Design an enzyme around this catalytic site. Sequence first.
Site, short mmCIF file in Angstrom:
data_model
loop_
_atom_site.label_atom_id
_atom_site.label_comp_id
_atom_site.label_asym_id
_atom_site.label_seq_id
_atom_site.Cartn_x
_atom_site.Cartn_y
_atom_site.Cartn_z
N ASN A 1 0.98 -1.61 -0.32
CA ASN A 1 0.43 0.09 0.44
C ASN A 1 0.77 1.27 0.42
O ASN A 1 0.33 2.65 -0.15
CB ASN A 1 -0.93 0.17 1.20
CG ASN A 1 -2.06 -0.93 1.39
OD1 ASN A 1 -2.43 -1.94 0.06
ND2 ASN A 1 -2.38 -1.92 2.10
N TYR B 1 -4.27 -1.22 7.77
CA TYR B 1 -4.13 -0.53 6.31
C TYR B 1 -4.61 1.20 6.24
O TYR B 1 -4.07 1.75 5.64
CB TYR B 1 -5.35 -1.79 6.49
CG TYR B 1 -5.88 -0.64 5.45
CD1 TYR B 1 -5.64 -1.05 3.85
CD2 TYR B 1 -7.21 -0.11 5.29
CE1 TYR B 1 -6.46 -1.31 3.02
CE2 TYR B 1 -8.26 0.60 3.48
CZ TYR B 1 -7.41 0.24 2.18
OH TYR B 1 -8.48 0.42 1.70
N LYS C 1 -3.01 4.01 4.33
CA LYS C 1 -3.64 4.85 3.26
C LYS C 1 -3.26 5.80 3.51
O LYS C 1 -3.14 7.17 2.87
CB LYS C 1 -4.85 4.76 3.45
CG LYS C 1 -5.25 3.37 2.68
CD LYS C 1 -4.94 3.23 0.95
CE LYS C 1 -4.79 1.65 0.87
NZ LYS C 1 -4.57 1.95 -1.16
#
Lengths: 254, 254
Positions: free
Chosen positions: B107, B151, B155
Amino acid sequence: MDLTNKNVIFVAALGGIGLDTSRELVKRNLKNFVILDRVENPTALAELKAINPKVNITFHTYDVTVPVAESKKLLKKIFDQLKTVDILINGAGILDDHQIERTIAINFTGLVNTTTAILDFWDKRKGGPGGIIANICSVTGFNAIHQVPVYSASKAAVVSFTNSLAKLAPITGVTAYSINPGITRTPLVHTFNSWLDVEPRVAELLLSHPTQTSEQCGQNFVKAIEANKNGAIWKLDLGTLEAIEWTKHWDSHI
Amino acid sequence: MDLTNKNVIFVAALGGIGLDTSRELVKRNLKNFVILDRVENPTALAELKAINPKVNITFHTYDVTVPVAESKKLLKKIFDQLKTVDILINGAGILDDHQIERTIAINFTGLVNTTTAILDFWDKRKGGPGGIIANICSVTGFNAIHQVPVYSASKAAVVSFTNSLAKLAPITGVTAYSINPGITRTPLVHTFNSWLDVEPRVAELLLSHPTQTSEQCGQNFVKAIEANKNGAIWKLDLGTLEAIEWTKHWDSHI
């Protein structure tokens, strides 16, 4: 929050603002001050012990880039000797956008892993007593210094992670808040690498604007710790201590 | 921005919202559509070609976790054949907080490295023609879903990195903006792992509130690309497209 007789673990206590923060911390009459750093610094260690011989100061070699299993091993040893740990301060960091992977591994991944490791001993769900986590982030986590985008991005990540930790407090028993210093004259020598060399004079330029002293930051750092406010986003800029309100652009409702 | 006859590279085009976005993109009569993904999806590839046989669709195996040197090697091959590339879409991603290192590597790190790799061919400082980068991030980058903090943090990092990229445009010639979808029913299987299992029912709960369709997101995704606004922070939530204003908590002054 009274730091008297408290057991504290400080990751990267002998570096940058960490040293001036450590000097102020030891003055609070802690019971045990555990320093975890990658590199040994005999001088700084000697100075700290000289400041308050009453505090038991121990140093353990620690590389935040090691696997969580490795961190759990070291932490287990510490909890075995101290029995309890009141606060964990994650202050490992690097500023060098020429080292992309390392920047992310130290500033972001390492902080998350050390936090994940200690939760094994603090998680109230596992019968743990809970705890407090103070994450040293950066104002670049709010608004980046676009010339060092990777560093800034890694810091934005920790500001977010810390905010999440605070919201999980009712479940884990572990509270958390972030300490975000503005530009300070703590890095012994100023000259960092910008991403793809977009601006080789970043340090020079940054120092051309109002900054704060390493001592001013250290004192406000301890004040924030004593404030002990779960979910606080502390901004230590220009010698002052202020809690900023994170803008709500989206809500999960859970 | 007219996508007609444009050459586009889409990293992770065959997954999640990427597939519905790809379906809409191919309808715009692109000259070349280059898909870079870990594993080929024959069905998806076949469907895309069937949508607009006029577009030359090519697939190249690509793992965003490889070193920048590796990415430069593949990109060189693509640029040698195509000569020019107008837009790069970084859409690789994973949601599984049980996989801390991988989450950050895919990510965050991977997006930064692919971006760093293409700048070798686009940097105006190197005589390059400049370019456009569309980064697929997430509303969790604004405000986290604290149950999946890693997560969300990864981001938040990309939202920051993208914002920085945009500010460097006058120097690199490369513009950039982020695409941040809200909760959407695109992941085939809905059931992700929360950090330390703080909430095993995250997916279930999230779906109990207003969401948007994968198609609604795909259409707004293309609209954002056509808007071609450097520095835009696009929020694709509940079927709408909106640009949010990032709060200025701190200013580097540089």
